[PDB]
Amino acid sequence: FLSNNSMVLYTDVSQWDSSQHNTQPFRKGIIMGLDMLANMTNDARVIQTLNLYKQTQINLMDSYVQIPDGNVIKKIQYGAVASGEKQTKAANSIANLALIKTVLSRISNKYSFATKIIRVDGDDNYAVLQFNTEVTKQMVQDVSN
Amino acid sequence: QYEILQKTIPTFEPKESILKKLEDIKPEQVKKQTKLFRIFEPRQLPVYRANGEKELRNRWYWKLKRDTLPDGDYDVREYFLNLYDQVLTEMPDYLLLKDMAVENKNSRDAGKVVDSETAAICDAIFQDEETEGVVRRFIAEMRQRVQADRNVVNYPSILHPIDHAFNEYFLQHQLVEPLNNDIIFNYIPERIRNDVNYILNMDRNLPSTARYIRPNLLQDRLNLHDNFESLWDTITTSNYILARSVVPDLKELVSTEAQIQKMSQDLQLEALTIQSETQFLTGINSQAANDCFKTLIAAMLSQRTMSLDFVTTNYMSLISGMWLLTVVPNDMFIRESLVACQLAIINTIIYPAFGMQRMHYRNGDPQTPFQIAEQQIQNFQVANWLHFVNNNQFRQVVIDGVLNQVLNDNIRNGHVVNQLMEALMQLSRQQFPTMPVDYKRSIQRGILLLSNRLGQLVDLTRLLAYNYETLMACITMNMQHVQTLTTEKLQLTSVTSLCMLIGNATVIPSPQTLFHYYNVNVNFHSNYNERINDAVAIITAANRLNLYQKKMKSIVEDFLKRLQIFDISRVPDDQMYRLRDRLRLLPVEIRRLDIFNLILMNMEQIERASDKIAQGVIIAYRDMQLERDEMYGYVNIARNLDGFQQINLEELMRTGDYAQITNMLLNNQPVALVGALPFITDSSVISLVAKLDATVFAQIVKLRKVDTLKPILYKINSDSNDFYLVANYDWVPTSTTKVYKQIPQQFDFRASMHMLTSNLTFTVYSDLLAFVSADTVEPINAVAFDNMRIMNEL
């Protein structure tokens, strides 16, 4: 999609694991999505396996971590998302496509474009925006700001 | 050892509601009352004679129970909208009067009165010191009269005439009807009790005492299929997951290892070459037949728009696609996916088989490719089938009050397959020149596997048209036919798994499923109609009471909340203010209207006969004698406001224009302020002689507010201080300003009693279909609408 009227927007989120957009609104967006799927079925088993996957999100809402140092063992509160889970490769890719869709809707109050592609891989992504007029040196410094 | 290190995390409560399926919406509780609706109570006040002195006796008067009436004229009309909401929940469905019956302690013979509050008033007046001999003799002859032939009772009462107009209305208009064993057998729909296959039986015959509450099944008055394309999409999806769980599954299919082995020899599939006949067997098993039979019946009972799904290189999925379009009406599949399936039949099965050039179909043409190819084709047997597909439509007839959409009489017979299997039996005989010989073999082989099952496929069309016409009889809400937003996808591979895996075994829906599908369509259609009438009655009653400052977003939000299937927080304020433009034009139910005209007629008597409020001051600047009353002694009360200009305070508190009431206070002109206005009370003659009542009006000029207005209401009696000025010197007390105020009505015992009449005993039954216990005739003898049975052919 590369041309002289488009630009690519790759952003490097520094601490993806423990940001504020990952603790409460990410675990409550999955729990709310498993309650619209408990009204779409009629078996007694499919309601149960959608209730147990919901139960792993309420328990990880307030999770403590254990780090040993010296003699003492520290217990630190950590309600965020780390790796080593099972869903962390397919649910981190949903939280990016919902966060970069909200940022590209707030930047469209200053410019007028048409998003060609968005592609997410964990926490490194890009998005190709196609503009009306030709891309200049001022439309690159003021989109990045 | 452990060291705890905790931090803050900000909370985040998303706006969510609790959604339920249609299978579990419980009916509401039957409202009954346990005490009478009282809004007035008696009270013992002292009495004063004409001079101003205090007499030895007392007197009873009516006063309000909990007179919490607010100041300001707009907050009184807001209070009577809240009182009208309290009566609509307090009103009972049935009222058995013998449950509220307290023994009368003083009587000729020990009878009963109607309430605990009724026997408290009778006891205090009887034991009173100053009571007269006539009223005390009247409480002795106060008992009930029981008639046992017609089961009625007459319990005595003591109520205000506004109280009597509310409790007499609750006894005359009850929601109970008598119940026999003929009203149970008419609760079942007419197509099921007149069915041959179901034998209906019951055990106990109910008495003549037994009553029941009838639901209101009248069709929807909002027209939610008309320009509400997001509230209709989630009211017909929730109607589809219910009808998916009711349509039965198939028993005794053809054994799959004995059918696919016969099928794989007729295709004669070679183990070496890539041909188009190895794809004729992909995806045929027992599970794909039980999920295509359900999604055909359950979509028709809910009017979901289906959507076909297929692959063009599978020719057997295109001959099974010739069977849906000649049975299911084409006004049900979505047009961007019905046309792309009709085009694949034409360019592969029909137009190559006749030797003509394949058609060039452009996007968005107004004619479907079957509607073009009946003009261009020249055969007769394949242009007669092709005319039924273009004119296959639902027939909207109204049976038993419910407009439901009926299939054609040829699909319901099975005679439509004898038009199909004579059309694709001539298309197999037409040799065709423009294609290679290995293409003629692959169409002629796959058209033979369907034309060998013609005995067991007429019998399939009679099963779809019978398991859909029986489950049609169990709905009550009006089924309408519009294109929905989201589509329920049907897979065309799983239609091949139904046409050639069925045989010789009828499945018929058991009556324990029919009596459950019927009892959750009544519980939703009745709940849909008791939330309209609870919401039209507040929208109309807020436009009659002139509430120009209230917005009806909140009371349409409450109407969507009680219907358990809609989520509120994703419905905007555009689709909720357009809804109360349809809830306004409806006429309100006759029980909510008569209980509102009883409030609107005497909403000025409940307001006037209370303390902590007054209806505005009159100002005279002229020395006027204040009137004498028996309960107040001497009091400055003006009973009627005439002869004076009026400056109402609600118009002065809305516009804020204080140019007139300032220029009328400075020039000393007589004026009469009008509005709900709180007052204070004093009792001293020195606060009258020193004229402390014309002082409180000078705050409207210095400030601008009128909310802190507190007039004076004098009260000069014998127990007041400095009364000897009134008795010694010959003067009536003369004031300047007086209060617009009314005098509470005297309480007379012999004229305020009543005789409440109601029944002795009911027995209210809620579930009616727990008495009948139906059973189905053996499914090998199952009789269709014509008396020849379904699933008969070998």
Side-chain angles (χ1 to χ4, degrees), chain A residues 20 23-25 28 32 38-42 64 71-77 79, chain B residues 1-7 9-14 16 19 21 23 241 245 570:
Chain A
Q20 205 200 336
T23 166
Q24 295 285 105
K28 275 181 168 169
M32 264 171 47
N39 308 333
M40 274 184 199
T41 180
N42 282 314
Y64 275 76
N71 195 350
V72 292
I73 284 185
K74 283 187 183 175
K75 294 183 202 163
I76 303 174
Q77 185 168 14
Chain B
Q1 61 215 280
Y2 302 113
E3 169 72 346
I4 304 307
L5 208 170
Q6 72 180 13
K7 78 184 178 189
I9 279 183
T11 187
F12 178 74
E13 294 167 83
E16 62 184 329
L19 272 77
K21 292 186 285 186
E23 295 191 4
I241 316 168
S245 91
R570 331 288 157 187

mmCIF file of all heavy atoms in Angstrom, chain A residues 20 23-25 28 32 38-42 64 71-77 79, chain B residues 1-7 9-14 16 19 21 23 241 245 570:
data_model
loop_
_atom_site.group_PDB
_atom_site.id
_atom_site.type_symbol
_atom_site.label_atom_id
_atom_site.label_comp_id
_atom_site.label_asym_id
_atom_site.label_seq_id
_atom_site.Cartn_x
_atom_site.Cartn_y
_atom_site.Cartn_z
ATOM 1 N N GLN A 20 -2.057 0.875 32.056
ATOM 2 C CA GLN A 20 -3.355 1.019 32.704
ATOM 3 C C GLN A 20 -4.502 0.550 31.823
ATOM 4 O O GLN A 20 -5.562 0.197 32.347
ATOM 5 C CB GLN A 20 -3.590 2.466 33.125
ATOM 6 C CG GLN A 20 -4.567 2.602 34.272
ATOM 7 C CD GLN A 20 -5.148 3.981 34.379
ATOM 8 O OE1 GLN A 20 -4.556 4.952 33.921
ATOM 9 N NE2 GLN A 20 -6.325 4.078 34.977
ATOM 10 N N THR A 23 -5.473 -3.579 32.804
ATOM 11 C CA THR A 23 -5.859 -4.215 34.063
ATOM 12 C C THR A 23 -7.370 -4.425 34.202
ATOM 13 O O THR A 23 -7.847 -5.562 34.172
ATOM 14 C CB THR A 23 -5.272 -3.415 35.236
ATOM 15 O OG1 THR A 23 -5.888 -3.814 36.465
ATOM 16 C CG2 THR A 23 -5.325 -1.891 35.030
ATOM 17 N N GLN A 24 -8.142 -3.352 34.349
ATOM 18 C CA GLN A 24 -9.595 -3.450 34.468
ATOM 19 C C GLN A 24 -10.363 -3.511 33.141
ATOM 20 O O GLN A 24 -11.219 -4.392 33.015
ATOM 21 C CB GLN A 24 -10.139 -2.311 35.339
ATOM 22 C CG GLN A 24 -9.688 -2.347 36.788
ATOM 23 C CD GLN A 24 -10.399 -3.403 37.601
ATOM 24 O OE1 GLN A 24 -9.825 -4.441 37.920
ATOM 25 N NE2 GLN A 24 -11.650 -3.140 37.951
ATOM 26 N N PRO A 25 -10.147 -2.636 32.139
ATOM 27 C CA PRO A 25 -11.021 -2.693 30.957
ATOM 28 C C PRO A 25 -10.748 -3.858 30.028
ATOM 29 O O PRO A 25 -11.575 -4.126 29.153
ATOM 30 C CB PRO A 25 -10.747 -1.362 30.245
ATOM 31 C CG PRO A 25 -10.047 -0.530 31.221
ATOM 32 C CD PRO A 25 -9.236 -1.483 31.993
ATOM 33 N N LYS A 28 -12.612 -7.022 31.865
ATOM 34 C CA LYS A 28 -14.054 -6.826 31.876
ATOM 35 C C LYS A 28 -14.639 -6.697 30.480
ATOM 36 O O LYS A 28 -15.856 -6.562 30.343
ATOM 37 C CB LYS A 28 -14.415 -5.592 32.700
ATOM 38 C CG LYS A 28 -14.528 -5.884 34.174
ATOM 39 C CD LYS A 28 -14.905 -4.658 34.965
ATOM 40 C CE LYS A 28 -15.295 -5.040 36.378
ATOM 41 N NZ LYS A 28 -15.430 -3.856 37.266
ATOM 42 N N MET A 32 -17.638 -9.557 29.709
ATOM 43 C CA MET A 32 -18.866 -9.084 29.080
ATOM 44 C C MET A 32 -19.133 -9.756 27.742
ATOM 45 O O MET A 32 -20.268 -9.713 27.261
ATOM 46 C CB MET A 32 -18.809 -7.571 28.882
ATOM 47 C CG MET A 32 -19.478 -6.767 29.971
ATOM 48 S SD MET A 32 -19.135 -5.009 29.799
ATOM 49 C CE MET A 32 -19.465 -4.773 28.059
ATOM 50 N N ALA A 38 -23.641 -16.860 26.523
ATOM 51 C CA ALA A 38 -24.412 -17.767 27.354
ATOM 52 C C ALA A 38 -25.901 -17.684 27.061
ATOM 53 O O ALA A 38 -26.684 -18.398 27.692
ATOM 54 C CB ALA A 38 -24.158 -17.480 28.835
ATOM 55 N N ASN A 39 -26.305 -16.821 26.131
ATOM 56 C CA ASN A 39 -27.683 -16.729 25.678
ATOM 57 C C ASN A 39 -27.848 -17.167 24.235
ATOM 58 O O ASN A 39 -28.961 -17.102 23.708
ATOM 59 C CB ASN A 39 -28.202 -15.297 25.829
ATOM 60 C CG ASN A 39 -27.983 -14.746 27.211
ATOM 61 O OD1 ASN A 39 -27.923 -15.490 28.185
ATOM 62 N ND2 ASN A 39 -27.866 -13.431 27.310
ATOM 63 N N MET A 40 -26.774 -17.599 23.579
ATOM 64 C CA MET A 40 -26.830 -18.009 22.186
ATOM 65 C C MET A 40 -26.887 -19.517 22.006
ATOM 66 O O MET A 40 -27.064 -19.979 20.876
ATOM 67 C CB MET A 40 -25.622 -17.461 21.422
ATOM 68 C CG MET A 40 -25.814 -16.060 20.886
ATOM 69 S SD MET A 40 -24.416 -15.500 19.903
ATOM 70 C CE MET A 40 -24.687 -13.732 19.921
ATOM 71 N N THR A 41 -26.747 -20.289 23.074
ATOM 72 C CA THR A 41 -26.670 -21.737 22.985
ATOM 73 C C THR A 41 -27.774 -22.386 23.805
ATOM 74 O O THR A 41 -28.516 -21.726 24.534
ATOM 75 C CB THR A 41 -25.310 -22.244 23.461
ATOM 76 O OG1 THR A 41 -25.279 -23.670 23.357
ATOM 77 C CG2 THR A 41 -25.084 -21.844 24.895
ATOM 78 N N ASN A 42 -27.864 -23.710 23.682
ATOM 79 C CA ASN A 42 -28.890 -24.482 24.365
ATOM 80 C C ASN A 42 -28.372 -25.734 25.055
ATOM 81 O O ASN A 42 -29.146 -26.378 25.772
ATOM 82 C CB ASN A 42 -29.998 -24.889 23.383
ATOM 83 C CG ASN A 42 -30.949 -23.757 23.083
ATOM 84 O OD1 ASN A 42 -31.398 -23.057 23.986
ATOM 85 N ND2 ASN A 42 -31.258 -23.569 21.809
ATOM 86 N N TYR A 64 -1.841 -11.437 43.007
ATOM 87 C CA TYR A 64 -0.603 -11.108 43.687
ATOM 88 C C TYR A 64 0.528 -11.938 43.098
ATOM 89 O O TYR A 64 0.325 -13.072 42.664
ATOM 90 C CB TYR A 64 -0.720 -11.363 45.187
ATOM 91 C CG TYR A 64 -1.334 -10.217 45.951
ATOM 92 C CD1 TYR A 64 -2.701 -9.987 45.917
ATOM 93 C CD2 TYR A 64 -0.545 -9.366 46.710
ATOM 94 C CE1 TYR A 64 -3.265 -8.942 46.616
ATOM 95 C CE2 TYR A 64 -1.100 -8.320 47.413
ATOM 96 C CZ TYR A 64 -2.457 -8.113 47.361
ATOM 97 O OH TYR A 64 -3.011 -7.069 48.059
ATOM 98 N N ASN A 71 16.390 -12.983 52.385
ATOM 99 C CA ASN A 71 15.654 -13.840 53.302
ATOM 100 C C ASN A 71 14.153 -13.719 53.071
ATOM 101 O O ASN A 71 13.438 -14.727 53.075
ATOM 102 C CB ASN A 71 16.011 -13.472 54.749
ATOM 103 C CG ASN A 71 15.586 -14.530 55.769
ATOM 104 O OD1 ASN A 71 14.866 -15.477 55.463
ATOM 105 N ND2 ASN A 71 16.045 -14.356 57.003
ATOM 106 N N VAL A 72 13.670 -12.501 52.838
ATOM 107 C CA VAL A 72 12.238 -12.254 52.761
ATOM 108 C C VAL A 72 11.696 -12.702 51.408
ATOM 109 O O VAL A 72 12.432 -12.902 50.440
ATOM 110 C CB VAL A 72 11.934 -10.771 53.017
ATOM 111 C CG1 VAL A 72 12.244 -10.417 54.456
ATOM 112 C CG2 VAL A 72 12.733 -9.900 52.067
ATOM 113 N N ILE A 73 10.378 -12.869 51.355
ATOM 114 C CA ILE A 73 9.650 -13.140 50.121
ATOM 115 C C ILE A 73 8.594 -12.055 49.982
ATOM 116 O O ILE A 73 7.746 -11.891 50.868
ATOM 117 C CB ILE A 73 9.019 -14.541 50.125
ATOM 118 C CG1 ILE A 73 10.090 -15.602 49.880
ATOM 119 C CG2 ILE A 73 7.933 -14.645 49.073
ATOM 120 C CD1 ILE A 73 9.548 -17.014 49.756
ATOM 121 N N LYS A 74 8.655 -11.302 48.888
ATOM 122 C CA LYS A 74 7.781 -10.156 48.702
ATOM 123 C C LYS A 74 6.527 -10.553 47.938
ATOM 124 O O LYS A 74 6.588 -11.323 46.978
ATOM 125 C CB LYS A 74 8.513 -9.042 47.959
ATOM 126 C CG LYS A 74 9.473 -8.265 48.831
ATOM 127 C CD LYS A 74 10.038 -7.064 48.104
ATOM 128 C CE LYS A 74 11.060 -6.343 48.960
ATOM 129 N NZ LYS A 74 11.706 -5.232 48.219
ATOM 130 N N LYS A 75 5.388 -10.025 48.377
ATOM 131 C CA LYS A 75 4.109 -10.232 47.709
ATOM 132 C C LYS A 75 3.639 -8.887 47.174
ATOM 133 O O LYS A 75 3.251 -8.007 47.948
ATOM 134 C CB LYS A 75 3.081 -10.834 48.662
ATOM 135 C CG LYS A 75 3.398 -12.238 49.118
ATOM 136 C CD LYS A 75 2.285 -12.773 49.995
ATOM 137 C CE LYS A 75 2.766 -13.892 50.894
ATOM 138 N NZ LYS A 75 1.812 -14.141 52.009
ATOM 139 N N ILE A 76 3.672 -8.729 45.854
ATOM 140 C CA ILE A 76 3.356 -7.469 45.193
ATOM 141 C C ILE A 76 2.034 -7.629 44.454
ATOM 142 O O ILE A 76 1.825 -8.633 43.766
ATOM 143 C CB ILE A 76 4.485 -7.053 44.235
ATOM 144 C CG1 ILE A 76 5.803 -6.947 44.996
ATOM 145 C CG2 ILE A 76 4.180 -5.728 43.570
ATOM 146 C CD1 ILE A 76 6.992 -6.690 44.112
ATOM 147 N N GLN A 77 1.140 -6.655 44.610
ATOM 148 C CA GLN A 77 -0.111 -6.663 43.863
ATOM 149 C C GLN A 77 0.157 -6.358 42.396
ATOM 150 O O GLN A 77 0.920 -5.445 42.071
ATOM 151 C CB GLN A 77 -1.088 -5.644 44.445
ATOM 152 C CG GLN A 77 -2.457 -5.667 43.793
ATOM 153 C CD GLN A 77 -3.482 -4.862 44.557
ATOM 154 O OE1 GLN A 77 -3.136 -4.073 45.432
ATOM 155 N NE2 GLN A 77 -4.752 -5.061 44.233
ATOM 156 N N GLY A 79 -2.304 -6.521 38.977
ATOM 157 C CA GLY A 79 -3.547 -6.846 38.312
ATOM 158 C C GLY A 79 -3.486 -6.833 36.803
ATOM 159 O O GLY A 79 -4.533 -6.880 36.151
ATOM 160 N N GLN B 1 9.566 -15.321 56.135
ATOM 161 C CA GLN B 1 8.728 -14.175 56.461
ATOM 162 C C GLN B 1 8.365 -13.388 55.202
ATOM 163 O O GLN B 1 9.124 -13.359 54.233
ATOM 164 C CB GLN B 1 9.428 -13.277 57.482
ATOM 165 C CG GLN B 1 10.755 -12.708 57.011
ATOM 166 C CD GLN B 1 11.767 -12.587 58.131
ATOM 167 O OE1 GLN B 1 11.725 -11.646 58.922
ATOM 168 N NE2 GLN B 1 12.687 -13.542 58.202
ATOM 169 N N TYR B 2 7.196 -12.756 55.220
ATOM 170 C CA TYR B 2 6.626 -12.113 54.047
ATOM 171 C C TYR B 2 6.449 -10.623 54.291
ATOM 172 O O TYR B 2 6.113 -10.203 55.402
ATOM 173 C CB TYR B 2 5.275 -12.730 53.693
ATOM 174 C CG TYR B 2 5.325 -14.212 53.433
ATOM 175 C CD1 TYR B 2 4.706 -15.107 54.293
ATOM 176 C CD2 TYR B 2 5.989 -14.716 52.323
ATOM 177 C CE1 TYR B 2 4.747 -16.468 54.056
ATOM 178 C CE2 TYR B 2 6.035 -16.073 52.075
ATOM 179 C CZ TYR B 2 5.414 -16.944 52.944
ATOM 180 O OH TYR B 2 5.464 -18.295 52.693
ATOM 181 N N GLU B 3 6.668 -9.828 53.247
ATOM 182 C CA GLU B 3 6.421 -8.392 53.284
ATOM 183 C C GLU B 3 5.431 -8.033 52.186
ATOM 184 O O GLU B 3 5.721 -8.225 51.001
ATOM 185 C CB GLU B 3 7.719 -7.597 53.118
ATOM 186 C CG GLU B 3 7.552 -6.080 52.887
ATOM 187 C CD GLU B 3 7.095 -5.254 54.101
ATOM 188 O OE1 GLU B 3 6.621 -5.796 55.122
ATOM 189 O OE2 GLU B 3 7.213 -4.015 54.020
ATOM 190 N N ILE B 4 4.280 -7.504 52.580
ATOM 191 C CA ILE B 4 3.211 -7.169 51.647
ATOM 192 C C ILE B 4 3.483 -5.788 51.069
ATOM 193 O O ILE B 4 3.731 -4.833 51.812
ATOM 194 C CB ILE B 4 1.843 -7.211 52.346
ATOM 195 C CG1 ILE B 4 1.597 -8.579 52.984
ATOM 196 C CG2 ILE B 4 0.728 -6.903 51.363
ATOM 197 C CD1 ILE B 4 1.768 -9.742 52.048
ATOM 198 N N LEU B 5 3.432 -5.678 49.744
ATOM 199 C CA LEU B 5 3.647 -4.410 49.048
ATOM 200 C C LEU B 5 2.492 -4.246 48.064
ATOM 201 O O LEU B 5 2.529 -4.803 46.965
ATOM 202 C CB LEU B 5 5.002 -4.404 48.345
ATOM 203 C CG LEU B 5 5.783 -3.110 48.083
ATOM 204 C CD1 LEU B 5 7.179 -3.457 47.591
ATOM 205 C CD2 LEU B 5 5.102 -2.173 47.095
ATOM 206 N N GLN B 6 1.477 -3.474 48.441
ATOM 207 C CA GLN B 6 0.287 -3.318 47.621
ATOM 208 C C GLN B 6 0.183 -1.894 47.093
ATOM 209 O O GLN B 6 0.762 -0.956 47.645
ATOM 210 C CB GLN B 6 -0.979 -3.686 48.403
ATOM 211 C CG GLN B 6 -1.379 -2.693 49.470
ATOM 212 C CD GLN B 6 -2.637 -3.111 50.195
ATOM 213 O OE1 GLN B 6 -3.090 -4.247 50.065
ATOM 214 N NE2 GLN B 6 -3.212 -2.194 50.959
ATOM 215 N N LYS B 7 -0.565 -1.747 46.000
ATOM 216 C CA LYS B 7 -0.715 -0.472 45.317
ATOM 217 C C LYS B 7 -2.180 -0.259 44.966
ATOM 218 O O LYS B 7 -3.013 -1.157 45.103
ATOM 219 C CB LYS B 7 0.149 -0.407 44.051
ATOM 220 C CG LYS B 7 -0.429 -1.160 42.862
ATOM 221 C CD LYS B 7 0.516 -1.130 41.680
ATOM 222 C CE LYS B 7 -0.043 -1.917 40.512
ATOM 223 N NZ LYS B 7 0.958 -2.074 39.427
ATOM 224 N N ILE B 9 -5.346 0.508 42.368
ATOM 225 C CA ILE B 9 -5.800 0.194 41.016
ATOM 226 C C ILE B 9 -7.139 0.900 40.837
ATOM 227 O O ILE B 9 -8.041 0.718 41.665
ATOM 228 C CB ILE B 9 -5.907 -1.323 40.787
ATOM 229 C CG1 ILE B 9 -4.536 -1.922 40.481
ATOM 230 C CG2 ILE B 9 -6.862 -1.640 39.646
ATOM 231 C CD1 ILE B 9 -4.565 -3.399 40.164
ATOM 232 N N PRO B 10 -7.310 1.721 39.803
ATOM 233 C CA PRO B 10 -8.560 2.469 39.658
ATOM 234 C C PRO B 10 -9.679 1.569 39.167
ATOM 235 O O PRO B 10 -9.491 0.736 38.278
ATOM 236 C CB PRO B 10 -8.218 3.541 38.614
ATOM 237 C CG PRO B 10 -6.766 3.348 38.282
ATOM 238 C CD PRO B 10 -6.413 1.960 38.669
ATOM 239 N N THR B 11 -10.853 1.738 39.768
ATOM 240 C CA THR B 11 -11.989 0.910 39.410
ATOM 241 C C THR B 11 -12.562 1.341 38.064
ATOM 242 O O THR B 11 -12.288 2.432 37.557
ATOM 243 C CB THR B 11 -13.068 0.976 40.488
ATOM 244 O OG1 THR B 11 -14.104 0.036 40.185
ATOM 245 C CG2 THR B 11 -13.660 2.373 40.568
ATOM 246 N N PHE B 12 -13.355 0.449 37.474
ATOM 247 C CA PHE B 12 -13.956 0.704 36.168
ATOM 248 C C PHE B 12 -15.228 -0.133 36.087
ATOM 249 O O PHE B 12 -15.160 -1.344 35.866
ATOM 250 C CB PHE B 12 -12.991 0.364 35.044
ATOM 251 C CG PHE B 12 -13.561 0.566 33.677
ATOM 252 C CD1 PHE B 12 -13.734 1.838 33.170
ATOM 253 C CD2 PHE B 12 -13.923 -0.518 32.897
ATOM 254 C CE1 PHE B 12 -14.256 2.025 31.912
ATOM 255 C CE2 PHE B 12 -14.446 -0.337 31.639
ATOM 256 C CZ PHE B 12 -14.612 0.934 31.145
ATOM 257 N N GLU B 13 -16.376 0.518 36.266
ATOM 258 C CA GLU B 13 -17.659 -0.161 36.210
ATOM 259 C C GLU B 13 -18.288 0.080 34.850
ATOM 260 O O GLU B 13 -18.765 1.195 34.593
ATOM 261 C CB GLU B 13 -18.581 0.344 37.317
ATOM 262 C CG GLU B 13 -18.117 0.013 38.722
ATOM 263 C CD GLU B 13 -18.877 0.786 39.784
ATOM 264 O OE1 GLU B 13 -19.982 0.346 40.162
ATOM 265 O OE2 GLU B 13 -18.370 1.831 40.244
ATOM 266 N N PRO B 14 -18.316 -0.902 33.955
ATOM 267 C CA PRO B 14 -18.976 -0.697 32.666
ATOM 268 C C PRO B 14 -20.484 -0.782 32.808
ATOM 269 O O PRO B 14 -21.017 -1.494 33.662
ATOM 270 C CB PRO B 14 -18.435 -1.845 31.809
ATOM 271 C CG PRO B 14 -18.164 -2.921 32.778
ATOM 272 C CD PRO B 14 -17.795 -2.271 34.090
ATOM 273 N N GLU B 16 -23.636 -2.215 32.122
ATOM 274 C CA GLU B 16 -24.142 -3.479 31.615
ATOM 275 C C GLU B 16 -25.442 -3.826 32.326
ATOM 276 O O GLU B 16 -25.719 -3.348 33.429
ATOM 277 C CB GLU B 16 -23.126 -4.614 31.802
ATOM 278 C CG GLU B 16 -22.783 -4.898 33.253
ATOM 279 C CD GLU B 16 -21.705 -5.953 33.404
ATOM 280 O OE1 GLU B 16 -21.633 -6.857 32.547
ATOM 281 O OE2 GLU B 16 -20.933 -5.881 34.384
ATOM 282 N N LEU B 19 -29.276 -9.884 30.730
ATOM 283 C CA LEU B 19 -30.140 -10.362 29.662
ATOM 284 C C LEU B 19 -30.533 -11.803 29.932
ATOM 285 O O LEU B 19 -29.720 -12.599 30.406
ATOM 286 C CB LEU B 19 -29.435 -10.273 28.311
ATOM 287 C CG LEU B 19 -29.524 -8.988 27.497
ATOM 288 C CD1 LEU B 19 -28.608 -7.932 28.066
ATOM 289 C CD2 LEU B 19 -29.156 -9.286 26.059
ATOM 290 N N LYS B 21 -32.775 -15.337 28.314
ATOM 291 C CA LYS B 21 -33.391 -15.946 27.152
ATOM 292 C C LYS B 21 -34.907 -15.938 27.304
ATOM 293 O O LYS B 21 -35.454 -15.593 28.353
ATOM 294 C CB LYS B 21 -32.890 -17.373 26.959
ATOM 295 C CG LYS B 21 -31.443 -17.477 26.557
ATOM 296 C CD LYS B 21 -31.068 -18.906 26.233
ATOM 297 C CE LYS B 21 -30.928 -19.727 27.491
ATOM 298 N NZ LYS B 21 -30.415 -21.083 27.186
ATOM 299 N N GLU B 23 -36.594 -18.647 27.308
ATOM 300 C CA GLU B 23 -36.982 -19.881 27.976
ATOM 301 C C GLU B 23 -37.224 -19.672 29.462
ATOM 302 O O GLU B 23 -37.992 -20.426 30.067
ATOM 303 C CB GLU B 23 -35.915 -20.950 27.774
ATOM 304 C CG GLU B 23 -35.751 -21.397 26.342
ATOM 305 C CD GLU B 23 -34.885 -22.632 26.220
ATOM 306 O OE1 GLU B 23 -34.481 -23.185 27.263
ATOM 307 O OE2 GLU B 23 -34.606 -23.050 25.079
ATOM 308 N N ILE B 241 -33.501 -18.632 18.901
ATOM 309 C CA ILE B 241 -32.833 -19.576 19.782
ATOM 310 C C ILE B 241 -33.843 -20.352 20.619
ATOM 311 O O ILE B 241 -33.540 -21.452 21.092
ATOM 312 C CB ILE B 241 -31.808 -18.827 20.650
ATOM 313 C CG1 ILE B 241 -31.032 -17.843 19.787
ATOM 314 C CG2 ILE B 241 -30.797 -19.769 21.239
ATOM 315 C CD1 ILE B 241 -30.223 -16.864 20.584
ATOM 316 N N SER B 245 -34.567 -24.905 19.888
ATOM 317 C CA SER B 245 -34.525 -25.932 20.917
ATOM 318 C C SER B 245 -35.819 -26.718 21.034
ATOM 319 O O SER B 245 -35.910 -27.604 21.887
ATOM 320 C CB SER B 245 -34.204 -25.304 22.272
ATOM 321 O OG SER B 245 -35.394 -24.950 22.949
ATOM 322 N N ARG B 570 -26.787 0.212 25.008
ATOM 323 C CA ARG B 570 -26.387 0.371 23.619
ATOM 324 C C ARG B 570 -27.524 0.859 22.737
ATOM 325 O O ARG B 570 -27.355 0.935 21.517
ATOM 326 C CB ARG B 570 -25.830 -0.941 23.067
ATOM 327 C CG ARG B 570 -25.170 -1.828 24.105
ATOM 328 C CD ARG B 570 -23.831 -1.295 24.578
ATOM 329 N NE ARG B 570 -23.510 -1.823 25.898
ATOM 330 C CZ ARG B 570 -22.477 -1.432 26.630
ATOM 331 N NH1 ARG B 570 -21.644 -0.513 26.168
ATOM 332 N NH2 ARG B 570 -22.271 -1.970 27.822
#
